[PDB]
Structure 1
Amino acid sequence: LQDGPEPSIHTQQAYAPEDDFTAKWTRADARQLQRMSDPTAPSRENSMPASVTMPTVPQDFPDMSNEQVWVWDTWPLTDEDANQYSVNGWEIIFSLVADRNLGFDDRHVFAKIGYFYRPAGVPAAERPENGGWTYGGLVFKEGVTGQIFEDQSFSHQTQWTGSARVSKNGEIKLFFTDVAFYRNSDGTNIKPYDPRIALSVGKVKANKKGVTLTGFNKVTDLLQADGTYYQTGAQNEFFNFRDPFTFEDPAHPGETFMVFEGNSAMQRETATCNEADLGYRQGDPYAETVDDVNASGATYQIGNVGLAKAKNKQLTEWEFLPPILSANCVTDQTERPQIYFKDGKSYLFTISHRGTFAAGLDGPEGVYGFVGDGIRSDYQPLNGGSGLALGNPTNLNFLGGQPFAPDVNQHPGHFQAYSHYVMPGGLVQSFIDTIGTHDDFVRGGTLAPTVKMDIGVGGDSTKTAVDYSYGSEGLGGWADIPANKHLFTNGKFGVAVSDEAAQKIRKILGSKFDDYLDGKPVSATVRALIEKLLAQYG
């Protein structure tokens, strides 16, 4: 470690979900990122430690849709424990997609949700190089998602990132960010954009030929920024509010929660930070003062992670709770939060950009993570108090550049991955933004290879380490989003089954089972036979 401030003291102690306690990712904590960087690291080489750095993705990569669409933020079908699902023999994922004719950086304001599917139960050695995914098309019919907005004057209307909860009958509750924009030809705002957390219910139809979705005809407006906990358009027209992830906390059975990205609810140009945001230990010769930080420009970076609680079992109404993490004077963007449970801990994982860090701070693109003894706790930022769990290869000694303009001295993998999502067993999937150098670089718009991050190394819950023996030197399969639970369902009855049971069921039963799963009527005798067999494994 290079000389610099000690990290902030955190206890990991749990509070009630309803308590007004918000953990801080402090300036002291984040300055550990500079301390971890090797200052000797020569041009275009990685300066961050290998154990918290994503293995390098090759610039020669396959495209998952054969270039039919641009693909980025992607998510599996999940249950309340974040297990990932196949339905009737098909792994299914949702992704943000855009018309491949657009410049990659114009994707955001024309984003739509589509889906991919592939056979479940295929060993890695038998899977196609590109992941073996088939593009299923768009989820929503034209015009459906605009229905929640009173002001229909929008210039752009998009579907942004969320999650998808699957029920045993193959019903899906798709949580997503429904966004209306109001812009001039030149890209400037008329009035503030309007991002909302929404739900649409639909259903999987799956047979031998493939997967189609029904429903997704109605959208329920669930949440919009409030102004007390989560910043609004009036407080800051470029406020962040997006990315719903729902789950059950083992410590609170029978409730459903949601994390999402917000911003601390301060008036943009009146925002300030205070001592706690800084978090320096008494006496530290590297401590900063509140006045200095308030001077620096850092008060414009006030990202947080929110919590909400469902007010019914249908998940159609929610209540805001106080934020669980704030990054005031640290970063603008604590994106795509999820809660991951392991060894009796709550791990909050989030992603952030290099560019969004406050003045005086810096770090790689990628996964930042926090650990604690509850979903609301005094979270301990992982790995030396830094927060860094999985950064893209980065020379922190040189400028970051941008995915559309790489710096001459920067690692060509600086923007190789984004919208990372942690899957069961610490497997991390992400999409490729840019790979290459100043004058020879390519855009991705397809998923990277899945990698493996071991969480809680050496008995120490605050430490993570990349497993470089996974796949081919740390790189697993292209777009590998594997299911660990397997639904069989006729659309009414269903069971969720393990990998091994899925295999045995598919082999034992015959074509009447294929009819059953396709929703065709069968005799009561044949049905009871099928369903009694299933029930043994659910």
Structure 2
Amino acid sequence: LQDGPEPSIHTQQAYAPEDDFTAKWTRADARQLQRMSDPTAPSRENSMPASVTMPTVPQDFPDMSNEQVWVWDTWPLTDEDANQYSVNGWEIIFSLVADRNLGFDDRHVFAKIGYFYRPAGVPAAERPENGGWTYGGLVFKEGVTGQIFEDQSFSHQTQWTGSARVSKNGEIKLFFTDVAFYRNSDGTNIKPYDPRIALSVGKVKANKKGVTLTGFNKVTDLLQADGTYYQTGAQNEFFNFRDPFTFEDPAHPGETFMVFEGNSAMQRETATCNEADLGYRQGDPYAETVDDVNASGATYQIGNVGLAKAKNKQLTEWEFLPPILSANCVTDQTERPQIYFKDGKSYLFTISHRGTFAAGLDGPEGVYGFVGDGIRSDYQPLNGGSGLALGNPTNLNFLGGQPFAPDPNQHPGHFQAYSHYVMPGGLVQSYIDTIGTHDDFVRGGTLAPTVKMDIGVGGDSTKTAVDYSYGSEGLGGWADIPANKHLFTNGKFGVAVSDEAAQKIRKILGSKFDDYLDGKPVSATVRALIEKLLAQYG
């Protein structure tokens, strides 16, 4: 550690989901990122510790869609505990896609949700190099997603990041960010954009030849920024409000929650931070004053993580609750939040960019994490109070540049990965943004190799470490998003099953099982024979 302030005191103590307590990722916490950086690290080499740095991704990478589309933010098919499912032998993912003929940096306003699929049960090492996914095309018929907007005069209408919850019958509840923009020809707004948390329901239909999706022909408007808990466009034209992740808390069975990204609800130009946002221990020689921070520009960076509660079992109506984390005068962007439960702890993972850190603060692109004793708790940022769990390789001694303009002295993997998502067993999937040097770089738009992050090194709940023994010196399969659970359903009856169970099911049963899985009628005897067996593994 270089000299610098001590991190803040956090207790991890849990509050009721409905209470008005918000954890702070403080300036004292965030500055532990700079203290961890090696100030001797030469040009283009990593300065952060290897245990919290993602393994380096090669620049000569395969493309998952054979360049049919640009792919980025991706999510699996999950249940309420974030287990990942195949349905009738197919693994299924959802991804943000755009037309390949657009410049990569212009994909955002033309983003749509597509899906891929591949057969379950194949080890990463036995797939095609590129992960062996088949592109199934777009989820939504043209027009559908625009229908929730009153003002139909939008210049652009996109579908952004979300989550997908599967039922035992192959029904899918697709939670996603439904966005309208109202723009001028030069990248300037006629009025603030309008990002909404929404839901659309559909269903998987599968057979030997692949998966197709039915439904998704109607969208329900679930939440939009309120202005008391989450910042609105009236408070900030460039407000963040996106990325719903739903789950069940083991402490609160029978209820469904959701985390998402917002900003603290402050008026942009009069926004301020306080002593608690700064978070220094009394008498710490490296302490900042509230005055210096609020004069610095830092108050433009007020990202938060929101919590909402479902009001019915169909998850069609929701209620905001107070934010669970704020990063006031720390970062503008605590993106893609997820809650991951382990050893009785609630882990909050989140991603952020280097450029979105506030004045005086710095850190790598990637996964930042927090641990407490409940979903609303006085979270402790992982790894010595820093919050860094999985940073791209980064020389913090030199400027970060941008994915479209790398810095001459920066590590060529600085933007190698984004929109990281932590999967069961601490496997982490991500997409490649940019890999390479100032004078020799490429854009990705396809998934990186999946990596592995061990959570709770030693007995220490607050510590993580990258498993460099995984796959090839830390790198596993290209676009490997595996299912740990397996659905078998005819569309009405279904069961969830383990990897091993799945194996002997497919074996014990013969070709009539194929028809049953196809939704094709079988005899009442055969149906009963099949479902009685399925029930025994269920």
With structure 2 as the length reference, what TM-score do the two structures score? 1.00
SS at match of 2:458: helix
Distance in 2 between residues matched to 1:124 and 1:217, nearest whole Å: 34
CA drift of 1:221 comes to: 0.1
SS at match of 2:425: helix
Query: Over residues 25-55 of structure 1, what are the superposed CA-to-partner deviations in whole Å (9 max), with x where a residue is unaligned?
Result: 0000000000000000000000000000000
Query: Over residues 168-221 of structure 1, what are the superposed CA-to-partner deviations in whole Å (9 max), with x where a residue is unaligned?
Result: 000000000000001111111110000000000000000000000000001000
Distance in 2 between residues matched to 1:32 and 1:525, nearest whole Å: 65
Distance in 2 between residues matched to 1:229 and 1:124, nearest whole Å: 43
CA drift of 1:508 comes to: 1.6
Q: Which residue of 2 aligns with 1:476?
A: 476
Query: Over residues 124-160 of structure 1, what are the superposed CA-to-partner deviations in whole Å (9 max), with x where a residue is unaligned?
Result: 3321111010000000000000000000110000000
CA drift of 1:387 comes to: 0.2
CA drift of 1:420 comes to: 0.2
Q: Which residue of 1 aligns with 2:207?
A: 207
Query: Over residues 448-485 of structure 1, what are the superposed CA-to-partner deviations in whole Å (9 max), with x where a residue is unaligned?
Result: 00000000000000000000000000000000000000
SS at match of 1:294: helix
Distance in 1 between residues matched to 2:201 and 2:336, nearest whole Å: 21
User: How do residues 330-409 of structure 1 correspond to structure 2 at under 5 angstroms?
Assistant: 330-409=330-409
Q: Which residue of 2 aligns with 1:465?
A: 465
Where does structure 1 differ by over 4 angstroms across 4 or more consecutive aligned residues? none
SS at match of 1:536: helix
Query: Over residues 198-249 of structure 1, what are the superposed CA-to-partner deviations in whole Å (9 max), with x where a residue is unaligned?
Result: 0000000000000000000010000000000000000001000000000000
Distance in 1 between residues matched to 2:125 and 2:467, nearest whole Å: 20
Distance in 2 between residues matched to 1:356 and 1:460, nearest whole Å: 29
Distance in 2 between residues matched to 1:522 and 1:374, nearest whole Å: 47
**Count of paired positions:** 538
SS at match of 2:276: helix
CA drift of 1:492 comes to: 0.2
Q: Which residue of 1 aligns with 2:515?
A: 515
Distance in 2 between residues matched to 1:11 and 1:335, nearest whole Å: 24
Distance in 2 between residues matched to 1:123 and 1:217, nearest whole Å: 35
Distance in 1 between residues matched to 2:121 and 2:21, nearest whole Å: 44
Q: Which residue of 2 aligns with 1:290?
A: 290
Query: Over residues 363-400 of structure 1, what are the superposed CA-to-partner deviations in whole Å (9 max), with x where a residue is unaligned?
Result: 00000000000000000000000000000000000000
SS at match of 1:346: strand
CA drift of 1:123 comes to: 1.9
CA drift of 1:316 comes to: 0.1
What CA RMSD, in Å, does the superposition of the two structures yield over aligned residues? 0.4
Distance in 1 between residues matched to 2:493 and 2:341, nearest whole Å: 29
CA drift of 1:509 comes to: 1.1
Distance in 1 between residues matched to 2:151 and 2:76, nearest whole Å: 32
Distance in 1 between residues matched to 2:125 and 2:295, nearest whole Å: 56
SS at match of 2:448: coil
Query: Over residues 291-323 of structure 1, what are the superposed CA-to-partner deviations in whole Å (9 max), with x where a residue is unaligned?
Result: 000000000000000000000000000000000
CA drift of 1:510 comes to: 1.3
Distance in 2 between residues matched to 1:205 and 1:353, nearest whole Å: 38
Q: Which residue of 2 aligns with 1:8?
A: 8
Q: Retained in 1: the 8 A contact 2:125–2:477?
A: no
Q: Which residue of 2 aligns with 1:176?
A: 176
Query: Over residues 340-371 of structure 1, what are the superposed CA-to-partner deviations in whole Å (9 max), with x where a residue is unaligned?
Result: 00010000000000000000000000000000
Q: Retained in 1: the 8 A contact 2:247–2:257?
A: yes
Q: Which residue of 2 aligns with 1:497?
A: 497
Q: Which residue of 2 aligns with 1:420?
A: 420
State the percentage of identical aligned residues: 100
Query: Over residues 4-31 of structure 1, what are the superposed CA-to-partner deviations in whole Å (9 max), with x where a residue is unaligned?
Result: 0000000000000000000000000000
Query: Over residues 97-140 of structure 1, what are the superposed CA-to-partner deviations in whole Å (9 max), with x where a residue is unaligned?
Result: 00000000000000000000000011233211110100000000
SS at match of 2:31: helix
